[PDB]
């Protein structure tokens, strides 16, 4: 992975790449790493892919159960507490490096949560194998209270830095823009990488394979 998050003037902009790996091979060229927590809170994920999916779902489930009971909009701290305490209970055996971002009645909030259960409240955070490359962009170009399109540009450039400089990351850039007014889930925000057009013709013409046994079962 590369995942990043930033706090701008109006709210939070989250970023992620779309590569998943099995050993040293690309397993999924287009993967969803920005996860739904609540209508106002989203969470980026890095580390063990399955641990990222299930942890983020369980908390999304618990928060929905919480918001239905309270009758009010869930808080980012609640999501943070639920994630922090759970990951700590498992002593880091659940490999989930997370970037948590959302907008409350309190305002815009951004967190980085580690597999062991340590949380950092910061204006900009990076997690994953390409996090240092992404951080180099944040340390070079970040300014307080940026405009919406300026922040969209910054995070996408940070993820790109991870994509091109880290072997664990690649493919598309995903963004999620959260404000007090609007939620924008831009799945394919950028397609920097593309497969080369095929030149040779390798059409396996009909009847090129020898068959020993055939059975055709009709259906409804």
């Amino acid at each position: 992975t590369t995942i990043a998050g930033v706090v701008y003037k109006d709210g939070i902009v989250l970023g992620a790449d779309t590569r998943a790996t099995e050993g040293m091979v690309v397993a999924d060229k287009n993967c969803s790493k920005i996860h739904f927590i609540s209508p106002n809170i989203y969470c980026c994920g890095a580390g063990t892919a399955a641990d990222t999916d299930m942890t983020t779902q369980l908390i999304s489930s618990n928060l929905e159960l919480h918001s239905l009971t309270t009758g009010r909009l869930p808080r980012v701290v609640t999501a943070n507490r639920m994630l922090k305490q759970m990951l700590f209970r498992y002593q880091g055996y659940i490999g989930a490096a997370l970037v948590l971002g959302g907008v409350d009645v309190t305002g815009p909030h951004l967190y980085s949560i580690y597999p062991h259960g340590s949380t950092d409240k910061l204006p900009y955070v990076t997690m994953g194998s390409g996090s240092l490359a992404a951080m180099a962009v944040f340390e070079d170009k970040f300014r307080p209270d940026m405009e919406e399109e300026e922040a969209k540009k910054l995070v996408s450039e940070a993820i790109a830095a991870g994509i091109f400089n880290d072997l664990g990351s690649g493919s598309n850039i995903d963004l999620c823009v959260i404000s007090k007014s609007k939620l924008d889930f831009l799945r394919p925000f950028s397609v920097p990488n593309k497969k080369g057009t095929r030149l040779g013709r390798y059409r396996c013409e009909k009847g090129t394979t020898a068959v020993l046994t055939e059975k055709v079962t009709p259906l409804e």
Binding site: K84, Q85, F88, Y114, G117, S118, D120, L122, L132
Partner: protein, 202 residues
């Protein structure tokens, strides 16, 4: 880390660096290591970020309930005892080095050390963290019996500045907090504000 707490007549002064590491990489270069437990009780955290964080959260929960159940401002010793009970019980599982410093309307300014073993001892001033190793000599030579609040602020700021210079695991920003009956006042020392000690060789 480097963490530090000093005691004076009116109350206590607390100091911490802002660096947190994941190996050799600095994950957060501007951390708040001074964690409020109650109105007048703080703790300085060193060691495992996740371990110290969980203990602090649980103590805040316990003392919070304890203070309401007694209907009385909570004693610093009581807060420090709740740290002792957890740090000692889970000594094999936690990597925690806590300094508990605060004020209560019965004993005044108090600085308690709960190191990795889980023991508890009250001190005039305490130092902890990886960086504290490099300032024992300085701290032993500079400390004076009966320093004022302002003198304690400078004393703790100087020692940290010297620790962050030599220790790789320490650096960034000096965070200071003064506790007395009045309340809690916090300040932050940035770049140039850090006490300048010239690098002198040949």
């Amino acid at each position: 880390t480097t963490i530090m707490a000093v005691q004076f007549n009116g109350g206590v002064v607390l100091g911490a660096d802002s660096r947190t590491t994941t190996g050799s990489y600095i994950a957060n270069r501007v951390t708040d290591k001074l964690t409020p437990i109650h109105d007048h009780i703080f703790c300085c955290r060193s060691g495992s970020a996740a371990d110290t964080q969980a203990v602090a959260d649980a103590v805040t929960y316990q003392l919070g309930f304890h203070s309401i159940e007694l209907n009385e401002p909570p004693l610093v010793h009581t807060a420090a005892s709740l740290f002792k009970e957890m740090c000692y019980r889970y000594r094999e599982d936690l990597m925690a080095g806590i300094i508990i410093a605060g004020w209560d309307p019965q004993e005044g300014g108090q600085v308690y050390s709960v190191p990795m073993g889980g023991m508890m001892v009250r001190q005039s001033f305490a130092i902890g963290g990886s960086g504290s190793s490099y300032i024992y000599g300085y701290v032993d030579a500079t400390y004076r019996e009966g320093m004022t609040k302002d003198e304690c602020l400078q004393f703790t700021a100087n020692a940290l500045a010297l620790a962050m210079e030599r220790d790789g695991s320490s650096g960034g920003v000096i965070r200071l907090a003064a506790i007395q009956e009045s309340g809690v006042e916090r300040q932050v020392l940035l770049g140039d504000q850090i006490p300048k000690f010239t690098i002198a060789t040949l």
